[PDB]
Design a protein around this ligand. Structure first.
Ligand SMILES: [Mg+2]
Ligand SMILES: [Mg+2]
Ligand SMILES: [Mg+2]
Ligand SMILES: [Mg+2]
Ligand SMILES: [Mg+2]
Ligand SMILES: [Mg+2]
Ligand SMILES: [Mg+2]
Ligand SMILES: [Mg+2]
Ligand SMILES: [Mg+2]
Ligand SMILES: [Mg+2]
Ligand SMILES: [Mg+2]
Ligand SMILES: [Mg+2]
Ligand SMILES: [Mg+2]
Ligand SMILES: [Mg+2]
Ligand SMILES: [Mg+2]
Ligand SMILES: [Mg+2]
Ligand SMILES: [Mg+2]
Ligand SMILES: [Mg+2]
Ligand SMILES: [Mg+2]
Ligand SMILES: [Mg+2]
Ligand SMILES: [Mg+2]
Ligand SMILES: [Mg+2]
Ligand SMILES: [Mg+2]
Ligand SMILES: [Mg+2]
Ligand SMILES: [Mg+2]
Ligand SMILES: [Mg+2]
Ligand SMILES: [Mg+2]
Ligand SMILES: [Mg+2]
Ligand SMILES: [Mg+2]
Ligand SMILES: [Mg+2]
Lengths: 122, 175, 210, 72
RNA sequence: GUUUACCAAAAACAUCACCUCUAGCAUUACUAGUAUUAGAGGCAAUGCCUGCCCAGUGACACCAGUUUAACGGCCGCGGUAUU
RNA sequence: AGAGUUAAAUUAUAACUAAGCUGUAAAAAGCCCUAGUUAAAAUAAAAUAACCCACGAAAGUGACUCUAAUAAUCCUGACACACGAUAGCUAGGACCCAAACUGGGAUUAGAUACCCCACUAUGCCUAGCCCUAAACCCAAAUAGUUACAUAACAAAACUA
């Protein structure tokens, strides 16, 4: 994967939830994303009340879409998902599997520093 | 302005065998469409060294360094046509131009034919450094313009006087 | 004389300007349509610059937006949607379909009445919010207007933005535009003069509550 | 220590600023006259340039623009 | 540039520029226009600027309160440093 | 450098309750279109992490995401070129909160100050200037040494 979409949707039932996911993925495919898979984290009560599209929500479903997308169309994706009203919060990040884990080889113990002051007698 | 195709199949994935038998999905992923700007920069840099360079494996050669710097300057001018108000990148562009000018002078003072080849091919016009860099202010440009115009009028009046004198000489010599 | 200081101007022809943005040719197809912009010209009647727009079998002179150029494509629609629309600079859409932070011009008052407000050069209103199927906009005079959401409006700012910064060189240019000089009578200022600080007048609403 | 020198320079700068504020318009008149003499000396210098080359009148299309008396 | 045609052509008026107020709007003005607009006025391009005051009289607010690029106003008496 | 976003506060504005609220060493002035609780746009600024020492040439930068990106096969070098904290200037916009100036209330022999209240330019964005700082780490850049050696203090003394 290259990009990851943290997609928090409105809490609603199965058929319009699947329909909203359908039009979201066709919106991605219209801008040209090659989507790998879709992930559901379930529906959870939100950490805080989020105001979006003239409404206050407390419960919402968490979904993840990972894809390969050109760098110019991410703004178009964010604009379309901003105008979409069945989503409460879309965000696009670089996927963490792109970077590789550099090695924690251990904590190097730092010496206390020498030679900071002159050898004058106080 | 060279135009890489979207199906360029970027630099790191060209020489591996068995590419054209693989379907359109992986070819689309490995093409320049989902690539970054730096992959396109590598593609342009490789094509430009294959276009102008004599022996491509030598990175340490001055002409190859000028090729890489020219790629970087073209990227910086694209960035400046995008963003006008950046000052750090404008500074980077001017020092990049200055280093390219210095290395072009170094190449010119050592090997003239290769320098002429790069100078013709890249479109760069090498301009010689003018002595006595002074700030041209309004009084100086006004006096210089006046002095040039006075010199033109002096030479024009001298040409008219010489033509009238030659006409008078021919007229009295004919009779 | 009922209005003073008008006369002696240059000869001007009047251009027939179509104010209704959504006007289908025939009633057989009432759907949204798409037209093509040919040229943008100066109009002596108003401060704005106009554009010739052709589609079907007819042309109309419309009020041009800021970056409308020769040979452009402009979409006119009435379709309101719950995914809204992606607003370009040329499109005409109803106010219910536009996003919240939309800059608009040629705002229609009553559904079917036609565009009346925000017509001068460089002036643009801004949509504020959409509640209970009713749109509220902010005018260039910073006054709130309450309108039905199905009224068609054009997204963008009117062309010739630097009309406010246009300098008049002489009184001869005023006489060319047709503004006669003011009277020489010295009138002492009354109580009406002075810097009046007034609170903003309330929202003007054209939605009729039953 | 160095605060004595700093305070002396501070007092000098404060007194100079009060002098500038009290005699602002006299300095404006002096500066305007100095710019006048600057422009006049420039005109005399250019006039000497076209007279010493043999001409009587300045070359055609030369309006000798005011470079010092520009509006603020 | 304009004006007291028939005693006054000007330092008078107008003028670009700069300021105030009053108006969210459709079939005869304004206008077949819509606040970067249109009227009611003041002062005069440009450059430096335009200091203080709502106590009175007006005008908005229909009472409080706000306004001077609104009408307008911006101090006495007495003693003191080598006169 | 652009584009997009807002968690903690705060506020315009509503609904209940109270007659007080703010203000200090102490008081007055101010507000009672006030105060507390519950709902909340816009603007401004980015707790903790940070006992971290990174990026940039310097000024400077530590809320989040994306895009473009951090010269030189790396010596010194201008009056040339390009940047340059805050404060300030022209035009447009925004204005929660802070606040020069100003007006009140305290203090004082006087207070056009230190204390308190309210408000303006301004601090914010876009576009153009201005080119100034205790721009200081008062220690120039690039290669090196711990040999000789303590004016004083401070951040030890020094070669090309
Ligand atoms: Mg007209
Ligand atoms: Mg016009
Ligand atoms: Mg007038
Ligand atoms: Mg008059
Ligand atoms: Mg002195
Ligand atoms: Mg005359
Ligand atoms: Mg007359
Ligand atoms: Mg007469
Ligand atoms: Mg006359
Ligand atoms: Mg006469
Ligand atoms: Mg006059
Ligand atoms: Mg002015
Ligand atoms: Mg004047
Ligand atoms: Mg005054
Ligand atoms: Mg009054
Ligand atoms: Mg009053
Ligand atoms: Mg910016
Ligand atoms: Mg009290
Ligand atoms: Mg607000
Ligand atoms: Mg923070
Ligand atoms: Mg580097
Ligand atoms: Mg150097
Ligand atoms: Mg600066
Ligand atoms: Mg500033
Ligand atoms: Mg303010
Ligand atoms: Mg006081
Ligand atoms: Mg510093
Ligand atoms: Mg120094
Ligand atoms: Mg140096
Ligand atoms: Mg001792």
């Amino acid at each position: 994967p290259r990009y990851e979409l943290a997609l928090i949707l409105k809490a609603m039932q199965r058929p319009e939830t699947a329909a909203a996911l359908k039009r979201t993925l066709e919106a991605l495919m219209d801008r040209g994303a090659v989507v790998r898979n879709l992930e559901n984290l379930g529906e959870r009560m939100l950490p805080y009340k989020i105001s979006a599209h003239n409404q206050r929500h407390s419960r919402g479903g968490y979904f993840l879409v990972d894809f390969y997308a050109p760098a110019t169309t991410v703004e178009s994706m964010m604009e379309h998902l901003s105008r979409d009203i069945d989503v409460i919060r879309p965000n696009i990040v670089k996927h963490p599997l792109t970077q590789e884990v550099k090695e924690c080889e251990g904590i190097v113990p730092v010496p206390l520093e020498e030679k900071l002051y002159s050898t004058k007698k106080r | 302005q060279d135009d890489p195709p979207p199906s360029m199949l970027l630099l790191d994935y060209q020489n591996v065998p068995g590419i054209h038998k693989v379907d359109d999905v992986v070819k689309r992923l490995l093409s320049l469409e989902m690539a970054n700007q730096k992959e396109k920069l590598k593609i342009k840099k490789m094509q430009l060294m294959n276009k102008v360079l004599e022996n491509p494996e030598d990175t340490s050669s001055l002409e190859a360094r000028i090729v890489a710097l020219t790629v970087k300057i073209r990227n910086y001018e694209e960035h400046m046509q995008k963003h006008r108000k950046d000052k750090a990148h404008k500074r980077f562009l001017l020092m990049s131009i200055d280093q390219r000018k210095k290395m072009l002078k170094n190449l010119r003072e050592t090997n003239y034919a290769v320098f002429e080849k790069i100078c013709k091919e890249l479109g760069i016009e090498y301009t010689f450094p003018p002595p006595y860099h002074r700030k041209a202010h309004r009084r100086w440009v006004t006096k210089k313009a006046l002095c040039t115009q006075v010199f033109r009028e002096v030479q024009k009046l001298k040409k008219q006087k010489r033509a009238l004198r030659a006409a008078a000489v021919a007229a009295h010599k004919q009779g | 004389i009922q209005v003073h200081g008008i006369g002696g101007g240059h000869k001007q022809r009047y251009r027939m300007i179509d104010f209704l943005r959504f006007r289908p040719e025939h009633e057989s197809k009432p759907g949204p349509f798409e037209e093509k912009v040919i040229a943008v010209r100066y109009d002596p009647c108003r401060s704005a610059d106009i554009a010739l727009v052709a589609g079907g079998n007819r042309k109309r002179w419309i009020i041009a937006t800021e970056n409308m150029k020769a040979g452009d494509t402009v979409l006119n629609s009435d379709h309101i949607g719950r995914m809204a629309v992606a607003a370009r600079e040329g499109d005409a859409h109803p106010l219910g379909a536009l996003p919240v932070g939309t800059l608009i011009n040629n705002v229609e008052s009553e559904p079917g009445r036609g565009a009346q407000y925000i017509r001068a050069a460089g002036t643009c209103g801004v949509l504020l919010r959409k509640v209970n199927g009713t749109a509220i906009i902010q005018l260039p005079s910073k006054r709130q207007m309450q309108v039905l959401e199905t009224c068609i409006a054009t997204v963008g700012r009117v062309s010739n933005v630097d009309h406010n910064k246009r300098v008049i060189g002489k009184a001869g240019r005023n006489r060319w535009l047709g503004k006669r000089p003011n009277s020489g009578l010295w009138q002492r200022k009354g109580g009406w003069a002075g810097r009046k600080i007034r609170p903003l007048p309330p929202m003007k609403s054209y939605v009729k509550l039953p | 220590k160095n605060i004595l020198k700093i305070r002396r320079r501070k007092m000098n700068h404060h007194k100079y600023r009060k002098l500038v504020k009290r005699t602002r318009f006299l300095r404006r008149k002096v500066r305007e006259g100095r710019l006048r003499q600057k422009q006049v000396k420039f005109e005399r210098d250019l006039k000497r340039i076209w007279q010493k080359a043999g001409l009587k009148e300045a070359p055609a299309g030369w309006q000798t623009p005011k470079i010092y008396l520009k509006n603020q």
